[PDB]
């Protein structure tokens, strides 16, 4: 990136907003950096779409809850050999707090870590 | 000592099964609730009290049950948002693991934590 140059995806002010929305924990910094990433002009295919319904809406409360909606996303796989041991525990921690599913990758991975800690 | 209680109990019931032996009966199941098996006597012609046990000696007809408990396991309840969280913190019961979980509250659910 370069101020003279073209546009990207992932940049300064949408980076430092989703850290400190995601230290802090507060929803509302997560609402601003949503705000933030979904104003620029259009830049891949999926941003010249539009959603458009017939229905009447209904409340938040009657929707399903973050748990069944969140045991729907995952971690792609990210080798030993690239990212840190540290890094790959974390990540392999986290994803299974939640009850979702996480991705070890290629490279193989460290036996000693079979048993739950 | 604890013969003696067992000692106790045992010559009360023995009493309870000659009793009904006398009578014409089997089983308690068969006595229970047949009220029209007693009657009121007076203590004699020297004392003069009005009571009247009749109030209750009245018998009320069951119908089609019968006059006694005619069911096994207690009365079961409503199931509340717990249910829920038991079938999702499995990895807890079986794995032995840290969990987080995240639903919605409302007024309408009692109990929230109790049977986990």
């Given at each position: 990136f370069r101020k003279s140059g073209d546009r990207h995806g992932w940049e300064g002010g949408v980076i430092h907003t989703l850290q400190q929305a995601v230290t802090n924990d507060s929803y509302?910094?997560?609402?601003?950096?949503?705000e933030q990433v979904n104003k620029r002009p259009p830049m891949q295919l999926r941003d010249l779409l539009e959603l458009r319904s017939t229905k009447a809406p209904v409340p938040v409360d009657e929707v399903e809850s973050i748990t069944?909606?969140?045991?729907?996303?995952?971690?792609p796989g990210m080798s030993m050999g690239a990212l840190s041991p540290e890094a790959?525990?974390?990540?392999?921690?986290?994803?299974?707090?939640?009850?979702?599913?996480?991705?070890?990758?290629?490279?193989?991975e460290d036996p000693a870590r079979f048993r739950p800690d | 000592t604890p013969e003696k209680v067992v000692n106790l109990?045992?010559?009360?019931?023995?009493?309870?099964?000659?009793?009904?032996?006398?009578?014409?009966?089997?089983?308690?199941?068969?006595?229970?609730?047949?009220?029209?098996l007693l009657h009121q006597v007076s203590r004699g012609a020297e004392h003069l009290?009005?009571?009247?046990?009749?109030?209750?000696?009245?018998?009320?007809?069951?119908?089609?049950?019968?006059?006694?408990?005619?069911?096994?396991?207690?009365?079961?309840?409503?199931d509340t948002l717990d249910?829920?969280?038991?079938?999702?913190?499995r990895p807890l019961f079986e794995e032995g693991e840290k969990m987080q979980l995240a639903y919605n509250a409302r007024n309408t659910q009692r109990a929230i934590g109790t049977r986990l």
């Open positions: 509302t910094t997560f609402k601003k950096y949503s069944a909606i969140r045991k729907r996303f995952i971690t790959h525990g974390t990540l392999n921690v986290a994803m299974n707090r939640i009850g979702a599913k996480s991705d070890s990758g290629e490279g193989g | 109990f045992t010559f009360l019931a023995e009493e309870v099964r000659e009793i009904l032996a006398g009578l014409g009966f089997r089983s308690l199941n068969e006595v229970i609730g047949r009220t029209d009290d009005d009571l009247d046990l009749n109030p209750r000696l009245a018998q009320v007809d069951p119908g089609e049950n019968a006059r006694y408990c005619t069911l096994q396991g207690r009365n079961e309840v409503p249910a829920r969280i038991v079938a999702d913190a």
